[PDB]
């Protein structure tokens, strides 16, 4: 996020980091329950990647994070890689997250819910702060 600010630690408890085998953070995701994460299809997650829950500072070793294996990647087969449309994947975890102060689920909308232009929302992540 460019021109954002640091979050209060633990205040976005559904936010996960997707890390590859080398420990590199490459994408975010959101817990929707203890067994499932929603992310983008274009992130290209595999069962060799790891979901990291409960994290704030990726440079700290003192956070009680949960490193969760991925059992199966469910890419929405409406996903169109040419247009990047329908850009959603579900990750089924091999072992459930343990919900806590700092690890819990985001709500999902009904398909008929209205989120009007002009509404102020929030986005979160460990993406670049400067290109």
């Amino acid at each position: 996020i460019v021109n954002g600010e640091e979050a209060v630690p633990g205040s976005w408890p559904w936010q996960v980091s997707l890390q590859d085998k080398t420990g590199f953070h490459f994408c975010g995701g959101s817990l929707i329950n203890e067994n499932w994460v929603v992310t983008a299809a274009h992130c290209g997650v595999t069962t060799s990647d790891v979901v990291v829950a409960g994290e704030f500072d990726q440079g700290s070793s003192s956070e009680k994070i949960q490193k969760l294996k991925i059992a199966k990647v469910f890419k929405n087969s409406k996903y169109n890689s040419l247009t990047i449309n329908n850009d959603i994947t579900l990750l089924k975890l091999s072992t459930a997250a343990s919900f806590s102060q700092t690890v819990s689920a985001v709500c999902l909308p009904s398909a008929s819910d209205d989120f009007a232009a002009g509404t102020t929302c929030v986005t979160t992540g460990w993406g670049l702060t400067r290109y």
Partner: protein
């Protein structure tokens, strides 16, 4: 480039798809929602994470960080997967697995 160690956040507005098309044209599909162009931007490494809106006291997943400006310009809208268009598939997938 700078990658942060610490989790970042930004507030930003939702756009209409019609208005977002003034920036991105026919790249904008119904299963996308644009947000930003407001002095902040999602950027590389944010992909897959949440765009949440607070409704009746609870944060609800409205978007999934998807794509946008290749330089993360804060004057151009970011593009997010529109969760309302995708949630039926989420529920079907959970039910079947």
């Amino acid at each position: 480039a700078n990658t942060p160690d610490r989790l970042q956040q930004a507030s930003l507005p939702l756009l209409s798809n019609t208005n977002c098309k003034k920036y991105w044209g026919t790249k904008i599909k119904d299963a996308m929602i644009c947000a930003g162009a407001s002095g902040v931007s999602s950027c590389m490494g944010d992909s897959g994470g949440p765009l949440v809106c607070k409704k009746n006291g609870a944060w609800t997943l409205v978007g999934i960080v998807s794509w946008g400006s290749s330089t993360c310009s804060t004057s151009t809208p970011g593009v997010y997967a529109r969760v309302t268009a995708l949630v039926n598939w989420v529920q079907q997938t959970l039910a079947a697995n």
